[PDB]
Amino acid sequence: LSQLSKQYSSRDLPSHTKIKYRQTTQDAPEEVRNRDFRRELEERERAAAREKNRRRWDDDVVFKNCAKGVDDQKKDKRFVNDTLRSEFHKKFMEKYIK
Amino acid sequence: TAEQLLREAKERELELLPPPPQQKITDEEELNDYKLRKRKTFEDNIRKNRTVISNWIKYAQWEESLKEIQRARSIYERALDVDYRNITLWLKYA
Amino acid sequence: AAAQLRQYHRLTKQIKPDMETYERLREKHGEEFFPTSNSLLHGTHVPSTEEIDRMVIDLEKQIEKRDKYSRRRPYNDDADIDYINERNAKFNKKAERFYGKYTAEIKQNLERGTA
Amino acid sequence: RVALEKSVSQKVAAAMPVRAADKLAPAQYIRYTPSQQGVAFNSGAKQRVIRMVEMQKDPMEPPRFKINKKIPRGPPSPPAPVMHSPSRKMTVKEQQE
Amino acid sequence: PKPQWHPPWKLYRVISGHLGWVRCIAVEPGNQWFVTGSADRTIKIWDLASGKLKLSLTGHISTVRGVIVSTRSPYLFSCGEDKQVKCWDLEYNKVIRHYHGHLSAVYGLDLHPTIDVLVTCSRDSTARIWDVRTKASVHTLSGHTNAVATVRCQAAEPQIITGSHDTTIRLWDLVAGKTRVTLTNHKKSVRAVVLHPRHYTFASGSPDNIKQWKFPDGSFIQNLSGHNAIINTLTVNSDGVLVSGADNGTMHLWDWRTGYNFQRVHAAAVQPGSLDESGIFACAFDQSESRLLTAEADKTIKVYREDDDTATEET
Numbered sequence: 001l002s003q004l005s006k007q008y009s010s011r012d013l014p015s016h017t018k019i020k021y022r023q024t025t026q027d028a029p030e031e032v033r034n035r036d037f038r039r040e041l042e043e044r045e046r047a048a049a050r051e052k053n054r055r056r057w058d059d060d061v062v063f064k065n066c067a068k069g070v071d072d073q074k075k076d077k078r079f080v081n082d083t084l085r086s087e088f089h090k091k092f093m094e095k096y097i098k
Numbered sequence: 099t100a101e102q103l104l105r106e107a108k109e110r111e112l113e114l115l116p117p118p119p120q121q122k123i124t125d126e127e128e129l130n131d132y133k134l135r136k137r138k139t140f141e142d143n144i145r146k147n148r149t150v151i152s153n154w155i156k157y158a159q160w161e162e163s164l165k166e167i168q169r170a171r172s173i174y175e176r177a178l179d180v181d182y183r184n185i186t187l188w189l190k191y192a
Numbered sequence: 193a194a195a196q197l198r199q200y201h202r203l204t205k206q207i208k209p210d211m212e213t214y215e216r217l218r219e220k221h222g223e224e225f226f227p228t229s230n231s232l233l234h235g236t237h238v239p240s241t242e243e244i245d246r247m248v249i250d251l252e253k254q255i256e257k258r259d260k261y262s263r264r265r266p267y268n269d270d271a272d273i274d275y276i277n278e279r280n281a282k283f284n285k286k287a288e289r290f291y292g293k294y295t296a297e298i299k300q301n302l303e304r305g306t307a
Numbered sequence: 308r309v310a311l312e313k314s315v316s317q318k319v320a321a322a323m324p325v326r327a328a329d330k331l332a333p334a335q336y337i338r339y340t341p342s343q344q345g346v347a348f349n350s351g352a353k354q355r356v357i358r359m360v361e362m363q364k365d366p367m368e369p370p371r372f373k374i375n376k377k378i379p380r381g382p383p384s385p386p387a388p389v390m391h392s393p394s395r396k397m398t399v400k401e402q403q404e
Numbered sequence: 405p406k407p408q409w410h411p412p413w414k415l416y417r418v419i420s421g422h423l424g425w426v427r428c429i430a431v432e433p434g435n436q437w438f439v440t441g442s443a444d445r446t447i448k449i450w451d452l453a454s455g456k457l458k459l460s461l462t463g464h465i466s467t468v469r470g471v472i473v474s475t476r477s478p479y480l481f482s483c484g485e486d487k488q489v490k491c492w493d494l495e496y497n498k499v500i501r502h503y504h505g506h507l508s509a510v511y512g513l514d515l516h517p518t519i520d521v522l523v524t525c526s527r528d529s530t531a532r533i534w535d536v537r538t539k540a541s542v543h544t545l546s547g548h549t550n551a552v553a554t555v556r557c558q559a560a561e562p563q564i565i566t567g568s569h570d571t572t573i574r575l576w577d578l579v580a581g582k583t584r585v586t587l588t589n590h591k592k593s594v595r596a597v598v599l600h601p602r603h604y605t606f607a608s609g610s611p612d613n614i615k616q617w618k619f620p621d622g623s624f625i626q627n628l629s630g631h632n633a634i635i636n637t638l639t640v641n642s643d644g645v646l647v648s649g650a651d652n653g654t655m656h657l658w659d660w661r662t663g664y665n666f667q668r669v670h671a672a673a674v675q676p677g678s679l680d681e682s683g684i685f686a687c688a689f690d691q692s693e694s695r696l697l698t699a700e701a702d703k704t705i706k707v708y709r710e711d712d713d714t715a716t717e718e719t
Contacts, residue, residue: 005321006369012539014323016501019520019537020477027434029475037435038692041453048454079420081675081702106288179383182549183571186211208402310579311519314542315535322540384547387572390588392627394612 335359406718410659410666416695416709426699428470429688441468470513483513518559525552531566554597561620569593589615596638609638631656641689653683675702
């Protein structure tokens, strides 16, 4: 080439001129080569997976108990692939449309 | 039937202009100038799309027709140089 | 399927394989369309370099303008055979259309309607 | 690191107008045959060496030769063989499918 | 003869919750944290140590198509459908620098093991080599008729390669500011590339067939066949097995030194009701190969472990 160098622009100013080598406190390549991480992860998942634990007014009504004992019917934590309604867009559309 | 027939007559009258083929191959080099304008239109058509097959084939037919050997071998050599795969086109140039 | 044999007769073909099939049937129809030749006299032109596939000289003198015209005849024959695709097969019926694209959309629409 | 140091030094140096350095010190004394001419008689002594130094620096005016033209691509690339096992066609059923 | 007793590979854990299909996956060198690029336009970070997550990264204009973890610096190289490939500094909880020069979306990225450089597979067909830490670039890699699907490089002899949609796997020699060779072995576009721990032969794959080539000099290795589907990814592990992910959802484990694969894995990872044809877009082997991170278009990352059984059948 030996050409096409004329004028500069922004965002091209000198930046991050000094890189950062891996410190011995974060990640050491030799310590990773000698690492026990197989058994360390087996023991970590072994502990985490090891412990997980945690009256005339009423008679005058023409109706009776209707909705009772129904709670878990709506899953508290559920990840649905369908983005149309699921849990999220059900309350999202319920709050944004009324 | 009057709607479809009316669309047939209006569609038949919807053609835009007839050809004006006058002064065909006259005034000596003027025909070569017309061939330069036609080759320029083919160069612009092949210039619009670098992946164009059709336009290259028409440039090859009109080339081999009016360009004799040299410029025709330049059309087949340029299109062949711009085509690696799709060897069927290389069989057309062959 | 069938590998090879010695015979000439009618067949069907004209199927989806297209390129490979039309080239195989075109080369078979071209080879069967052109019988043998004077190569016995070229059998006098034969000498010692014939066999030994890998070639020492692949060019030599070719033949002459004779083989040039005889080479140009099957080119015009393949041009006339390539000029045969379909016929006009037109008429005045049903509704109108616009140029080619509406006729192609009518053929594809007829292909989609019948299933 | 040497190739990336030279290329990164030229490209990173040109992309960063730090004005490089003053000039250079290539006194560049050149002793060589003038294209091995062997012309009539002798145009010099031995190989006819010449003194070769650097060039004067750039003035305050950036423009020297302005091109900014357009010639994108234009070379082709050498085609290779297919180098693939030819498969079987689709016949009537798989192609018509 | 199918030697070396290929062990059976089974599931480990299931993960979900992402807002979009997972395009890319990466893991920390010390197995401390994980990350995945996703279709939701936000860079995903999931710490899998306990089965947990890591962090939610934002600021990508489009879906991230690739990511990398730098060994020297805590900067994760970012690549996405927005054509902006930006290495991110995580030390400040914010990015490192944004690379430039990509004319179209970046289909891939890579980091050189020794020198500091940024490799990219750019849908313009341009594979970007960049001198990086300086904010510099390096060289532009061209010659692929179609877009570059994959990118790979090494500190060994100029092994560089870019998987191209043009059906010819590209080989670049970068050292000279140059290329290496054109690989015509693949009959179709190669969407898969892998580097085996044997380091002798570069691995690649395509929907038509998988192409393994023994390098440096232009030599080849073997043609891996028997899995017919669109090949999403190929990953070679240290045990001698290479899992092949597909867009149809069929992950075929690979016995390699035996000449043929170690398993044909057909399983349904399908999330709730939206399924369609979505398969596993990418996968990653762990450091100890005790689990396999599974990134699928259903936004479900499922690690894979084994039950430690004898088995070892043949065919």
